Amino acid sequence: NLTEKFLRIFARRGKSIILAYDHGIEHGPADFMDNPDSADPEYILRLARDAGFDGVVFQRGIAEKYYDGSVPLILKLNGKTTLYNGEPVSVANCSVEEAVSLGASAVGYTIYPGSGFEWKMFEELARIKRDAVKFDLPLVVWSYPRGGKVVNETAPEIVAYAARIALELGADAMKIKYTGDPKTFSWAVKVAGKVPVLMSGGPKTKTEEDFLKQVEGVLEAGALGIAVGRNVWQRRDALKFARALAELVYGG
Amino acid sequence: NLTEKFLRIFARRGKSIILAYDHGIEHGPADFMDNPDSADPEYILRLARDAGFDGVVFQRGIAEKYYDGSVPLILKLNGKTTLYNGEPVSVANCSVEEAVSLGASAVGYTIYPGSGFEWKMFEELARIKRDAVKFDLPLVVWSYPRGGKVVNETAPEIVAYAARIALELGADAMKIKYTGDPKTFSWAVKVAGKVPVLMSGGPKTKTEEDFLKQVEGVLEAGALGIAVGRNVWQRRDALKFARALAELVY
């Protein structure tokens, strides 16, 4: 049972905080400027360890050059850029077998339900899923409806659709966007059934209290925890705020 | 003879009812709200068992997390969403070999004849058919003409085309849309020849009686039975209505 394996490694305290760090390919380095140490993967590993978080998310190149075994790794297999203008598509740049060789405890893959290329990602995810089972690595699916008929990615019905597709296609855990309130988010959590749900972090909020309030709602809705990037490492008080998130999530 | 195998497993009584549950990927969970337990695959397996139905249809993810061997399983290999806007296409997210491993007694695959991508699904179906034969699992084809010159999906000439194509491509059983009357639907059943036909369920009808009359016509036309989803599990009286169907079909 790969969901059970995921919970043992990444949620030993009953809830989970993952520090996401695929931003270098997805958005590029501009956002690293507010807190420049954030461009150094070594800083990121130290932050996760010092805040007592459960894991980090790296692309293959960062894992090969920097990963040191100090915190559990989710190897994010696909990536795309914001420079791209076509229908949303993100293809694998790494195999599951290679992810095992790089020290990963799980693999990650993004889908964009609704995209004109939704079929390309479903076809490839099928091969990745089959390999994840073969190598006994849990599959974490980032489910982000985008393209086609999608006009509001945080609409209650779109987030609940995101959650259900990830379950149907074989995710062992998933990452989805927050709706902005615990009632509607609790429906997304419910339709995901046995597969745990992590809140996607998002752009840096206006105040720390805005983000902590969103986290409180996610937990109230029955989610497993958060996968946070910018709202930790883009802050100059990254470590102090990370430790406040830990107390909210693990203590609450 | 995989048609004979299909009939032994899914139609021991001479007719068949399958509980379809691929909705979560195909349409998303919005329809689960009317009867909120319908979002729970465990609740769906109990309903099939308790109503005395022949089978359930799950995608790979639901089968892996929830299937427990209690009712025969058709593993639906491909899936698409209603968020998608392009030419109709649905690709396999699971192999026949993996279906066998998940406890399947048959495999399912949707084609959309007429689509700009009709070739992509015929190409994949060729591989799935070869594997279904190799692993001795019957192939059930959902045949839904869509795109291209198709305007009315329930027109008699379109449903008959859907049925003939499924036979020509190697289906051991098929699922097609009802025409709305037994005479035209009997032509589709005829052109399917030795391959049995199941009626696709469709959106929840205005009354329970509206659906019962549809099923009556389907049986009069010589079809094997029904593959029903929403017209059972979207109802708050799901089990009661499911037992009325069983009495009708069997």
Place this chain on the structure above:
Amino acid sequence: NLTEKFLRIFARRGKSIILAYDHGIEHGPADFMDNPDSADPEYILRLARDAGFDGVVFQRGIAEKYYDGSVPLILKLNGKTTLYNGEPVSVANCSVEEAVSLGASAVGYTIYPGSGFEWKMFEELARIKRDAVKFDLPLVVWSYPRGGKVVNETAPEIVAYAARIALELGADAMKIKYTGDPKTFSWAVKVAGKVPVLMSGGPKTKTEEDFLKQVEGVLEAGALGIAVGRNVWQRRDALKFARALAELVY
């Protein structure tokens, strides 16, 4: 020499009549209504045997469910529908190895020279040809220029091009459309060289004598014979007319 094998099996008397029955996927069942028994493949095999024809053409599904070894079989590997609107393309839904398993004495494949997808069909034919040689099954190519710059499919120069392409790509026998006169059709036959040419039957003619006169012209032009579908099985005097064709051709 796979042409020699083809002639031994399908042209023992020196000329050939093949009964074509891929119409269920290519056009759908609409035309079967004229002579309803034509929707039953069992009836098709009976017609072929009782007229003394040389072979039949089936898709994999039909061959799997109905072929009984009583008349030599050409297994048609690709198929498309008329519901499709894109640039013309037809992909294989069956392999040569599977055709051998179903009892085929030859395999068939359609190309559409000029299509925006002409590359896709040439790439797949290459794989099929290689397999046909490996399994020692003659390859019969239906050569139907369509799409791109093709405006009149029965123009003398288009039919000659169709014939030559089939030869160049490795056809062991071919099937092309009639130009409507023996002089221009004799040029298509000449440019096909050592590869024998079968006339494509086409839509049902206004009278039986119109079709017989086409056949007379085809034989005058030096063609091996005819692959006929509708002009036999769409008629209620199917057997009687089939015997008249056998009289003329043999």
Place this chain on the structure above:
Amino acid sequence: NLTEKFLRIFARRGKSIILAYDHGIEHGPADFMDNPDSADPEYILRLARDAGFDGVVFQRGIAEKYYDGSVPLILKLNGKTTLYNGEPVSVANCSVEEAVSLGASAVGYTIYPGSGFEWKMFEELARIKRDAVKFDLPLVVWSYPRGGKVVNETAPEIVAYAARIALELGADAMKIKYTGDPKTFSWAVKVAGKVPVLMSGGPKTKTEEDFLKQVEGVLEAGALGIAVGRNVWQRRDALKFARALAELVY
């Protein structure tokens, strides 16, 4: 060194004349009418033999049915038609391994640099080149920039780009269009380096003297020789003229 092998087989006298005969697929049979024997591949082999030429170029189908080992063979692996209207593309209809079995001493492949599909042919050529090395058969590249920014294909800078691309991708010999003058053609020859260059024949010229003048310029420019089709076999005095070309070139 596959260039040295190519020269030993196809240029024993120091220069080369290759009789090209892929016209049947590339342009169709219309041009065979002037000298009707040109439609017959046997006549082509006799002509190359009687004239003392170095080789012939056949597609796989012609080689399989007609090639008799009497003159060295280049097997042209890819082919497209003039009926096709999309971005220029020509895919392989035969493998290198199959070419070896059919008696080829070399393989041929066309690229269209600048095409929207240039990537598709470069991707396939990589596979063909790897196999050419594996089977020890020289690779002859027909380099014909077409599509994209290309307008006039005989412009000096386009023909030089054509020659350089063929060298860079791994050609052991190449075939390119003439610029119409020896000075610009010699720059194409220079940037091709160690890889020898054959002039592409082109449409039949107004007079025999026009063609002979072109050949004189190609030789002055330092090319290896010519790959001639129409300008030999489209003539009623084909053998007489072919013998005059032999006297000039050798």
Place this chain on the structure above:
Amino acid sequence: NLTEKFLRIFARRGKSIILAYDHGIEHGPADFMDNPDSADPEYILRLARDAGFDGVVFQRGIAEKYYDGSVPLILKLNGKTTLYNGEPVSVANCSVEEAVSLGASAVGYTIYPGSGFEWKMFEELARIKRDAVKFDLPLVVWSYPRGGKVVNETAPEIVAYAARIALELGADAMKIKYTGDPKTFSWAVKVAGKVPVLMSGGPKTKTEEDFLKQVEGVLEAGALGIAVGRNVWQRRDALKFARALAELVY
């Protein structure tokens, strides 16, 4: 550690100069006219060794026909032409296994982040990276954002994105465009982390001092060095200027 192997072979003195020579396919031979010996790969090898440079970059054809082991070789696996008008895409014409056979010490591959085909190059780069690791050959990525939202290829934010992408995808070393000042270029170097950066050379500058000042900025920003093509071999004083570059960099 393949970065360490790259540094040992191509940067033994602590900084690196590579002589790039994929121009023949990427741009064509027009530029070779200014200094005509530049069309001859033997001249390019002699130039790199006489100037004391660390390496040369060749496509497969040039390496097969001309490489002699005299200077370390980076085999550039993909290539496209300027004749092409679509969304930027460049596909492999050679495998890592073949590059090993041709004497390569590293392999090169270009990506165009932002292109409508960015996925096609990421998917291929995945297989190349896997093979680079298997055969123990460093992977050098040319990262040139182009297409999509990219409108200024030398903007600070774009060159930093180029560098970061190459790190994320598995490059052991990278080549990117200069921003025009050392402060913004040092941010690109920083975000590349442990992966060394080479400056892409570009079109011939108006003066030698314009290029020398760029190279001075590059070194000030902390880059490993330069991969120069035109700004050396397009000059009539190629060797003199190459020796001045070496004095500055080493």
